[PDB]
């Protein structure tokens, strides 16, 4: 006979996940390129404005 043996459940276990699960995340690459362009352009706007004002301060001094 068989009494007290480790055995599986009558209905079985729920299925486990074994297939590859690496979902794609993130905006499309051109969105990141556009954001980089916008950040750099705004930074250049600020930096060149600062350089020009610094030159006028140099004139005053």
């Amino acid at each position: 006979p068989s009494v007290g043996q480790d055995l599986p459940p009558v209905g079985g276990y729920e299925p486990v996940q074994w297939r590859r699960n690496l979902p794609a995340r993130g905006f499309r690459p051109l969105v990141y390129l556009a954001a980089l362009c916008g950040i750099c352009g705004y930074g250049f706007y600020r930096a060149l404005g600062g350089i020009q004002e610094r030159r006028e301060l140099k004139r005053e001094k």
């Binding site: 600020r46 404005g49 600062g50 004002e53 610094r54 006028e56 301060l57 004139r59 005053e60 001094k61």
Partner: protein
Amino acid sequence: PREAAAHWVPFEDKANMPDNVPDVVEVGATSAPLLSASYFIGAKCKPYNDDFMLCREESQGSGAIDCLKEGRRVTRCAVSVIEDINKSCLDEFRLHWQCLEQNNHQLSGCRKAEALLNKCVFTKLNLEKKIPGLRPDEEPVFLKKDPWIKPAVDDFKSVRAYAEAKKNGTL
């Protein structure tokens, strides 16, 4: 002229000026008050400064000893303007040069004190601050509102005095 190199000692000369040379007062302001007053000195003493420099050029090598009387005029005019500032606008002038002493002598760090100083000097001395060489399109930076470059800490006494002047209506 180059700065001194490896080993040097400073030495003072104890002689007096030759008695033929007429004596003159010397400017007693230090670097910060002088920088604060520089534009007013320029405005008032331009003809004498120009004459002194022209004399020096025309002397063609003997300028120190040939322009002493022109230099005497230059120094007297500078002393006169600083005396006038000390008589009519001392509080604001002191605000401005103490601010400069806190801000590495950068005029951009002291615009609030400078506004009061300029208004005082214009109303009681009829001197105007002006930057030479700009076109009418170009805006002088000291008149600019909302500048890119601002001081790290707006000067305390200057902020208070500026707000008070805005209440009073002087500025």
